[PDB]
Amino acid sequence: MREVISIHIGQAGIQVGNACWELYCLEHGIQPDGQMPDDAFNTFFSETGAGKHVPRCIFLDLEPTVVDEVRTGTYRQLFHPEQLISGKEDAANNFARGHYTIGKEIVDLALDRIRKLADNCTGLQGFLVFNAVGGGTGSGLGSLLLERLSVDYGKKSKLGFTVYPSPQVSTAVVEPYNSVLSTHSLLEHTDVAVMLDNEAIYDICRRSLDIERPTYTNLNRLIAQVISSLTASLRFDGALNVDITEFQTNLVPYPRIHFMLSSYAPIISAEKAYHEQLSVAEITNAAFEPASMMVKCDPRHGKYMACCLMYRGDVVPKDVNASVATIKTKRTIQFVDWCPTGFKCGINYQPPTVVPGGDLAKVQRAVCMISNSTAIGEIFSRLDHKFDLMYAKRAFVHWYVGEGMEEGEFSEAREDLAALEKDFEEVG
Amino acid sequence: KSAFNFTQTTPVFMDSAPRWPKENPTWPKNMKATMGYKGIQSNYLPTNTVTLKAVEVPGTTERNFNF
Ligand SMILES: Nc1nc2c(ncn2[C@@H]2O[C@H](COP(=O)(O)OP(=O)(O)OP(=O)(O)O)[C@@H](O)[C@H]2O)c(=O)[nH]1
Ligand SMILES: [Mg+2]
């Protein structure tokens, strides 16, 4: 009854699907072979006629070279073999191919799954879109898929966890372009869009985790710790159980501004816990610390329109309202005037679970903050520079125009960004 | 103004003995009641006690309510 649909698009889409679904199988005692030795799992699974607990998700991609790893990995008895969708040829880091040529010939298949994935669903909270902006499959298929989801349901909520291109780290050259094209299609179609950059999560692994050989498998073990904290209320008892609609009402002031930041705390090695107490007071000071952001944005250059705090573990509300109160007084944190409030707080009694072989530590208090700030214009203006720096020469255009696209789709998707950055200044 | 015997003209012949709902040295004046205010107002719960401050910086609002 309190159920969501978890979509994974692209490579990083399924790269985090392997971290998230290694968590819920472990957080509920679900063995890799489906069965375990209600509503604690009904948010993510579906008990069949006998014993088996299949998940409710969909792995979508164009290169089999990764979706087949799931078919050969230890989680092969888990998924319905039709959920693991894959293609023959790939998008080749080209937004057009993922949108016009190849996208149009598998969405008709993916959509049938969702229809057969929503009939058993009795009360659907909202879709859950794990996306990686910057590639043809991530940006093209994701864009084409979201529009199809809007015209089918519309009233259902889409949450966009989209990895965003970082300032320094860039595993591609044309990733500015398809990152721009994604906006015009995600903005009107996602209900709320969280952002996070592969660079910001790298430094988190430097100061806090003190892990010097970080890898994509490390970072994904952090994102799964967010969604686990985000949907704890959906499946675990706790004071101030916070659903999705509640979470969404008091965070998005205007239909445009739904690009928000994230954080997590405490993030520590399993040994520095021996040098700290990690009180509710201490953690919430670190959630608002700029170095604990999962995106390379600086909230001290902007203002806060709202925040949402999902605590976990041995936490009582008498200490939440106290630590929040000593933050509105802090000078560094500037709240835009038209919200004297700004905090929706959530508590759970189920502490964060730890995976064997992970880097975090077993703790009894943990915080995940998700703030809607007007400093988010920074990371959004860098793109407006690299796009205008390369597009001045029409570099790499002959690939996009050769795949059933045109020259208008560049200038069009460019104004939408300017149309957006004003909205992050009208709120001054 | 006859049949009234006004106070301004009542020779000490006429005189009254005060009765209970009135203070007098003979009967005890039992305890009374007053309102005691909320406490020192703040942005967290109001308290009676004054505490130290880490960030002094004249004319600024910084506290540590959580201790
Ligand atoms: N946090 C995280 N980011 C990843 C991971 N893998 C890739 N990325 C980033 O995703 C971006 C590219 O997205 P991809 O999914 O690999 O490409 P695509 O969307 O499938 O499109 P095609 O390459 O044409 O198939 C790069 O910037 C990567 O840094 C991962 O495992 N974890
Ligand atoms: Mg790819």
Q: Give the tokens for residue A50.
A: 């006998």
d(CA A207, CA A201): 11
Q: Is A220 annotated as a binding residue?
A: yes
Name the pairing type of β-strands A57-60 and A365-373. unpaired
Please give the method by which this entry was determined.
cryo-EM
One-letter amino acid at B50 equals: V
Interface of B with A (CB under 8 A): 43-44, 60-67
A279 min Cα distance to partner chain B (Å):
10
Distance A64 CA to ligand 1 centre (A): 15
State which of A18, A97, A163 you would mutate to test the pocket of ligand 1, scoring each by most atoms of that ligand within 8 A of its C-beta: A163
Distance A160 CA to ligand 2 centre (A): 18
Short-list A367, A358, A354, A368, CA closest to A278: A367
d(CA A280, CA A287): 11
Residue A335: count of CB within 10 angstroms of its CB:
18
Do the Cβ atoms of A329 and B61 come within 8 Å? yes
Distances (CA, A) of A331 to A283, A302, A303, A343, B17: 18, 13, 12, 17, 68
Residue with tokens 């996602």: A190
Helix (H) or strand (E) holding A304: strand A304-313
d(CA A304, CA A57): 34
Is A251 exposed, middle or buried, given 0-12, 13-18 or 19+ CB atoms closer than 10 A?
Answer: buried
Name the pairing type of β-strands A157-164 and A124-132. parallel
A21 min Cα distance to partner chain B (Å):
37
Q: Is A408 annotated as a binding residue?
A: no
Helix (H) or strand (E) holding A5: strand A3-9
Q: Is A242 left (phi over 0), alpha (psi -120 to 50) or beta?
A: beta
d(CA A113, CA A135): 24
Is there a contact between A64 and A90 (Cβ–Cβ < 8 Å)?
Answer: no
Q: What is the DSSP string of A25-40?
A: HHHTT--TTS-----S
> Residues near A409 by Cβ (< 8 Å), separated by ≥ 6?
A181, A400
d(CA A169, CA A296): 11
d(CA A264, CA A385): 30
Name the pairing type of β-strands A53-55 and A45-47. antiparallel
Interface of A with B (CB under 8 A): 279-281, 319, 321-323, 325-326, 328-331
Is there a contact between A366 and A326 (Cβ–Cβ < 8 Å)?
Answer: no
Do the Cβ atoms of B62 and A330 come within 8 Å? yes
Catalytic residue set of A = 246
Residue with tokens 């994102």: A223
Is there a contact between A231 and A199 (Cβ–Cβ < 8 Å)?
Answer: no
List the beta bridge partners of residue A159. A128, A192
Q: What is residue A418's three-state secondary structure?
A: helix
Q: What is the DSSP string of A214-269?
A: --HHHHHHHHHHHHHHHTHHHHS--SS---HHHHHHTT-SSSS--EE--B-B----
Is there a contact between A286 and A292 (Cβ–Cβ < 8 Å)?
Answer: yes
Is there a contact between A295 and A200 (Cβ–Cβ < 8 Å)?
Answer: yes
Residue A354: count of CB within 10 angstroms of its CB:
17
The residue whose CA has the least distance to atom 15 of ligand 1 is A11
Q: Is A196 left (phi over 0), alpha (psi -120 to 50) or beta?
A: beta
The residue whose CA has the least distance to atom 5 of ligand 1 is A12
d(CA A251, CA A345): 12
Range list of H helices, A239-359: 244-249, 280-287, 317-328
Q: Give the tokens for residue A65.
A: 């070279």
Is A202 exposed, middle or buried, given 0-12, 13-18 or 19+ CB atoms closer than 10 A?
Answer: middle
d(CA B67, CA B57): 20
Resolution of this model in Å is 3.6
